[PDB]
């Protein structure tokens, strides 16, 4: 048994999970888990248990769990870079794929794998280099990833009629390839838009994925590489129901390769209801700081907040959520900032707001959850390190999110998930149906 | 009242449908329409009523209906080109959008609209021209459409904080623009791949959409233009549950613009379980014809089919479907072929199979629907007219399918449909849930 080759490890895990699901469906396949109402159909399947997605699960008490592990558990258990304290995305992906915390050796192996597979074909480089500056970074990302499907081993093998039993293998290879390439596509977009088309340089075969990424972005600050490791780890997955995960799932169910599936997912992520909360918080912070200065007292800030909520406006990043308490993905970033930039004026405001907003929201009685989420904290940190181009923040989210959705995609094909095909009805149709 | 401006007509229809749904949801929003089982979750939401999609509805006895009209009814009622017998796609789109059969004047107006809006921006032209020959036509299509989102009026307006009440308007404008541009994108792909990069030439402002399309493809046979009109009409829509419709719906629900939504949908359409059936039938027909020769007897062909099924293989185009009889989209194409290429040897085989395969499948008693679908007939017709490049066939399907999904998209935003967000569960999670 190979102790580092993820593919071999995954081959040994698959049959056992297949057997387990086969037995589960024999015994409980007919078990009802919910009802479908008219309202659910009009309201985007809200509250409808609709799909199986294995890699992550929202714990109402603890926040998002990656294969049963909470964020704080991942923070402790996942390997780090040498001389680093943030969990490496590699180890997260290993976790999502195998269900097991990787060893150091396993993480180091994965790093080398993604470094080896990182080449872009010249047609994708040419295409990126020709895009104009008014083409949104997310559109460049999706178009380039679609154009990378020329490299798909799965598309080619399916056309030669390979056995169903081998689908996950080729899906695994393509997903590994795509993950390897993403930092190169993303950095090329960053440089072409915001560094006058300068080169991304080379991949170093001895660096982790995050560090090749920050190098290609043109950053040379060890704590920005640490932020990037954390960022990429914690945004990696958040169940199957969000649009980006669901889009990848749905497209992937037609046996579209991972490049096609992931690019479609990015078009969903680009949606202003899925993809912009981080930017929105940062815009609002920046306006607030311009209005009241960089050194407002707790008392004046409490009045400002009181007045903003009383005039029907929200505080971005606060007030929505299933969670009873602060999103651990917020806490992570607060810890980071307390260690590395405690004197930063914008961070101090973000920290002031953390003390004040929740108690004001409780008092006003309007919001069910007064605590902030991950997007409340991310922007201030990216800006601190020089990453000020807010349009680009969603590309970072997408590079992260590739980890979760592609880890699931492998499993979807390993377990033989069929085509996603719900039944639609018209309003006219539904009206007739209910009269019966 | 404007008698030709679709936008004004649509503005008068919307409030009445809003009112009707508001009332329907007050009275029956809580009405249960179905149950969710464990099996449905593992099986891609099969048999789960999951969404409202207005533009078309599958009649279990008669096939697909476009706003209540069957395909043969649409064949009679929809306007034709001058000196033509086939229904214009323009009139189909008008039908899906308004629920009304358009007049001649309305169709003529729509043709001019799509001719006026047909320009490609230079960056999309450059990108297409630089794609290499090994990049699949569907990938080129999706990438170009994503790159066209720089032209989205909706994306821009949403970022300036437009009222929800106005979403459909800009969605309407972008959808009209995209539909106008698609033949240009598709023909550029065709010419760059298969006509040595020659130009697509001009849009004639007095031609219908289909005829500008066939002109830009480089075709001159009037009956190929007639095929194209029929083809584009009948593939336009098929409820919301198929992957391309559903992907557009899902992405569109995040308020991604129609370019992003449509491009994601094409990545779903590119999937071998949604979009390769046409090519697969044609490959199998060609092999069969080589093996048994032209003018094979009924008897020899029946034996061939029995032997294929008895050796565990299926006959492509036959045997799957929820429909209990021949797909009307198949019948349409058979009628076309009987009129225009009755003595074509491949067509004769397709017709022989129609006589024999279903009877054999009935006799065998296994496959629950023995009749063929649309993809059983399309390839022989395209090949007859010189469109032999099978990789390209799915682009035609996608240009057609734009009509349905974008007609619905306008309505989805008009009616205020929210983000599509089902709940996912893991296997471990589902097991715990059922024990409770
Ligand atoms: O995608 C995610 O991280 C889940 C999501 O949209 C949210 O709950 O805000
Ligand atoms: O969307 C389509 O028309 C192809 C398809 O899957 C169906 O006909 O059910």
PDB file of C-alpha atoms in Angstrom, chain B residues 3 7 29 52 70 89 96 119 121-122 166 202 231 283 291 299 302 325 344-345 359 382 419:
ATOM      1  CA  UNK B   3     -48.565  46.109 -31.469  1.00  0.00           C
ATOM      2  CA  UNK B   7     -40.896  44.888 -24.536  1.00  0.00           C
ATOM      3  CA  UNK B  29     -48.247  27.849  -0.907  1.00  0.00           C
ATOM      4  CA  UNK B  52     -41.231  26.590 -11.647  1.00  0.00           C
ATOM      5  CA  UNK B  70     -47.893  21.201 -29.462  1.00  0.00           C
ATOM      6  CA  UNK B  89     -37.565  30.571 -34.559  1.00  0.00           C
ATOM      7  CA  UNK B  96     -42.505  31.483 -25.305  1.00  0.00           C
ATOM      8  CA  UNK B 119     -22.412  42.935 -33.770  1.00  0.00           C
ATOM      9  CA  UNK B 121     -17.012  43.205 -29.991  1.00  0.00           C
ATOM     10  CA  UNK B 122     -13.471  43.002 -31.290  1.00  0.00           C
ATOM     11  CA  UNK B 166     -36.661  46.687 -13.371  1.00  0.00           C
ATOM     12  CA  UNK B 202     -22.460  40.416 -43.428  1.00  0.00           C
ATOM     13  CA  UNK B 231     -34.237  22.581 -36.134  1.00  0.00           C
ATOM     14  CA  UNK B 283     -21.580   7.107 -35.739  1.00  0.00           C
ATOM     15  CA  UNK B 291     -21.558  -3.699 -41.963  1.00  0.00           C
ATOM     16  CA  UNK B 299     -35.546  -9.412 -41.931  1.00  0.00           C
ATOM     17  CA  UNK B 302     -34.505  -7.216 -37.423  1.00  0.00           C
ATOM     18  CA  UNK B 325     -44.696   7.448 -27.934  1.00  0.00           C
ATOM     19  CA  UNK B 344     -30.953   9.388 -49.336  1.00  0.00           C
ATOM     20  CA  UNK B 345     -29.512   6.026 -48.300  1.00  0.00           C
ATOM     21  CA  UNK B 359     -41.473  -3.471 -32.467  1.00  0.00           C
ATOM     22  CA  UNK B 382     -27.240  17.557 -41.246  1.00  0.00           C
ATOM     23  CA  UNK B 419     -31.602  32.200  -5.438  1.00  0.00           C
TER      24      UNK B 419
END
